[PDB]
Amino acid sequence: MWAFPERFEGRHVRLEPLALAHLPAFLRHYDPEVYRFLSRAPVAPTEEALRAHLEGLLGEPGRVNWAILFGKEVAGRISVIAPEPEHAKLELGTMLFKPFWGSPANKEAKYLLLRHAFEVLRAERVQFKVDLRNERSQRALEALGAVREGVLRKNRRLPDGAFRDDVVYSVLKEEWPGVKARLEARLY
């Protein structure tokens, strides 16, 4: 199994293990648009629904999550999803609260995880999955230099029964230096 650090310290953000103690931040910044392109989106603007969403993140097998601290606030979270040491690959996903969109929080959170994945664990592949209707995230991954591999059609079903398409992106280890350079240019 791969071991990850509990905490990361960046120039703009710091990361620490995501926990139930972070629930208050999710309750202080609830906005439907933030969860609309995520599976298991809070089913209602209530503490019970947001608690269920947070517990789902913390309970997915193999998933490792960090709260992203920006200044003195929790800006959102970043997740290592389905890490597979045997194939030297993993998936990464983030979610930021609306007020922090546009801040450097998301890029540095990714920068920090990607560096550990590629340089320390030496993963060969990191992938990202974005809802095809989520154009903001698609532009951000294209800006990061991630390669668009294609669209998994009807790859997830919503609770009302409708289906969503997942756009799959990846960064391979040989591509990390170039991606890393673009992230540093924008963060430092």
Place this chain on the structure above:
Amino acid sequence: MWAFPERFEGRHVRLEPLALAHLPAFLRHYDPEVYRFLSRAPVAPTEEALRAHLEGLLGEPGRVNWAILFGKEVAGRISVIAPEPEHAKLELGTMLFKPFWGSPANKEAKYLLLRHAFEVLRAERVQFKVDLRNERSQRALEALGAVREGVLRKNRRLPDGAFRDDVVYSVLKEEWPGVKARLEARLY
């Protein structure tokens, strides 16, 4: 959870639960080319390696496997991989022994599973993953009418440490009638 039939009866083949009792067929028809584009390929032309490969198929969580009987011989196997009732999707994969390549065994095995997946379980999506170097299987999926969604680069690592790319194909439920028609034209 979805329930599948233990047996299927086609015009050219019949399917029954894959089991250790089928090991003899794997030992009677060993050819490296048959396993070269599969993960966990038998590590040696020996009963011990083929037994490990068969037990790996039978032990993968959620995987359901059938021996394909062609005439009085086992022609290979077909597998439902990672079925996910919640998202109405699954992956399907087959492996046929060399002597049966070109027979109707593979198409009817797929025909039988696809019909149950789409018409009875009402899955919305069935996907297939093929090694990018496996051109025979890519041509067969294109002949079946499956949609090539893209290439998951370095999606699996071999035991020697080399990486393989996976080409991802799918058939959606709305496309099944057309695919079904092409399969019936060639089988009946």
